Every structure is written in C-alpha cells, then in structure tokens.
C-alpha cells in the first residue's frame, strides 16, 4: 500500500504490485481506486519527460483520471 492522494472531487487509494519497461523506475505497477473494493485501474508507465514536466508545476488532483493538467 503506497498511500492515499486527496483530490477535489474524489481520492486515490494506490497499491504497488510486482507481477511475478520492467526496471529502473518502472519496476513496479500501480493500481488506483476511488473507494476500497471498487474497480481498480492500472496506471501507465512513467516516462522521464513527464516526470521532468511535472517537476515544474504544482497542481491539485481533481480525482478524475481523464482530466487535463496544465
């Protein structure tokens, strides 16, 4: 269990799994849910571009995954 992220309209429970590209910072996979016991969603893999681009902003999560950022 990684933790919980608070959003504006919903929240994110985050689980970190290992599954029996696959190294560096993508060694683990992350599944998020809005409520415990609800349907899970796998997050994509991280790319250094979006890490570097998020390192320059400061945003509140909206609790919806299909939302714009900046």
């Amino acid at each position: 269990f990684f933790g919980k992220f608070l959003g504006l309209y919903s929240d994110y429970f985050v689980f970190e799994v290992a599954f029996k590209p696959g190294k560096g910072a993508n060694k683990f996979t992350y599944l998020v849910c809005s409520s415990l016991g609800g349907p899970l969603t796998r997050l994509p893999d991280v790319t250094p571009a979006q890490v570097k681009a998020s390192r320059r902003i400061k945003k509140l999560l909206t609790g919806r995954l299909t939302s714009h950022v900046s």
Partner: protein, 37 residues
C-alpha cells in the same frame, strides 16, 4: 506510507515566459561595395 495532497514543500517559482530568439549577427551579413572615385 504516504497520505496527502501530493504537493511538495519547496519555494515555488512559477515559470517565466520562455526566452525570445535572437537574430543573425550583422557583422557577417553586410552589404559590400566597390571602391569610390
């Protein structure tokens, strides 16, 4: 564990407008001329 909003704790400086591009150096683009009387 981590519980929170996701925001770092550091002095936040919003990004300035990006740089403006310069032009070509005039010292290497200048009209020549032939000799004068």
């Amino acid at each position: 564990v981590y519980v929170g909003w996701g925001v770092k704790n550091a002095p936040f400086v919003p990004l300035p407008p990006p740089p403006v591009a310069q032009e070509f150096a005039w010292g290497e683009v200048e009209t020549q001329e032939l000799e004068l009387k």
